[PDB]
Design a protein around this ligand. Structure first.
Ligand code: HEM
Length: 309
């Protein structure tokens, strides 16, 4: 079949919890490290972990390593089922709440600058909480190295190596399937971020890592073609210039703008090729840009929806 003739929404269902590599993780502590901001940190107690980021990666990797039961709080992006009853420590999108964090009496915060404010991260450290700043590479090629970095922090290097190798094998196997499914002329895609029916409506660029998802699905990321390094408002002019064949979206984000019907009301959407085919690939919000352990499964499920009728 010709995937340019497909129409309508394709939605990937929740992939669920990460399968841990062990049921008896025994952290080798203490650990001393210099983090991505240059802070020297001693990690001596991992009993109460806050693994916080915009993308939902760290909570999933921590579970993959065998420490899911140690997670005591989360951001909204960590939507995996195991954490559904775990306290949320952000407000709005991803704004850190110092009071909520400190009231959970964490022993370790793993975080990066995808969320903030920076000043709240500094307050938590000053209050006596061991805080480790990561700067993950967030590419498909670096899935294993990003896992190994997290594993080092919690004193689980062997589990890290197992999880890294398993995840890299899964993502290379998925890529074999993707390559067989892709059309000769790649589909043009964008990652369209939506939250609500108002102005939170953006084409995501380099900083958010959607290019590696789109290219992992065999597509061309029109944001990369046009040099978008952070994000651009998805206004009519931008949409006409990018003119994708498929909008890649987050499932709950799409619901929040009124589903396909609401999306089609937004200026410029209906005039693109994707809009004329009402062609949206919706991915679970908390997996879509998480990469990490589940990347291979995500690529497999998404490529089936893109290329198999
Ligand atoms: C790129 C990765 C991002 C991910 C994975 C992500 C994920 C999420 C998730 C899971 C929620 C909670 C949705 C709900 O429970 O209703 C949320 C809410 C939100 N996001 Fe994002 N988001 C991202 C980027 C952004 C960006 C770039 C902005 C703004 C520039 C933004 C603004 C918001 C806002 C305002 C909310 C609050 C919506 C509400 O009132 O419930 N997000 N996001």
């Amino acid at each position: 079949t010709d995937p340019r003739t497909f129409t309508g929404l394709s939605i990937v269902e929740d992939i669920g919890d990460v399968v841990p590599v062990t049921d008896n993780a025994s952290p080798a502590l203490p650990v001393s490290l210099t983090d991505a901001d240059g802070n020297d940190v001693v990690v001596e107690d991992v009993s109460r972990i806050l693994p916080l980021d915009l993308y939902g990666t760290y909570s999933k990797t921590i579970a993959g390593l065998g420490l899911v039961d140690n997670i005591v709080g989360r951001t909204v992006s960590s939507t995996e089922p195991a954490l559904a009853d775990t306290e949320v420590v952000t407000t709005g999108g991803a704004t850190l709440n110092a009071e909520a964090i400190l009231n959970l009496h964490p022993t370790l915060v793993i975080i990066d600058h995808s969320i903030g404010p920076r000043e709240v991260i500094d307050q938590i450290r000053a209050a006596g909480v061991a805080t480790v700043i990561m700067s993950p590479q967030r590419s498909i090629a670096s899935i294993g190295d990003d896992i190994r970095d997290i594993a080092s922090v919690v004193g689980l290097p062997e589990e890290g190596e197992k999880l890294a190798e398993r995840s890299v094998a899964e993502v290379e196997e998925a890529s074999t399937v993707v390559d067989e499914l892709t059309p000769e002329d790649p589909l043009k895609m964008v990652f369209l971020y939506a939250r609500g029916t108002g102005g939170v409506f953006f084409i995501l660029g380099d900083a958010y890592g959607g290019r590696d998802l789109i290219e992992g699905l065999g597509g061309v990321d029109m944001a990369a073609e046009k040099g978008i390094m952070d994000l651009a408002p998805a206004n009519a002019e931008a949409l006409a210039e990018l003119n994708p064949d498929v909008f890649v979206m987050m499932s709950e984000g799409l619901v929040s703008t009124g589903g396909i019907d609401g999306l089609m009301e937004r200026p410029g959407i209906a005039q693109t090729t994707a809009g004329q085919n009402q062609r949206v690939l919706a991915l679970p919000d908390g997996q879509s840009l998480a990469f990490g352990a589940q990347t291979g499964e995500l690529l497999l499920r998404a490529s089936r929806e893109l290329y198999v009728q």
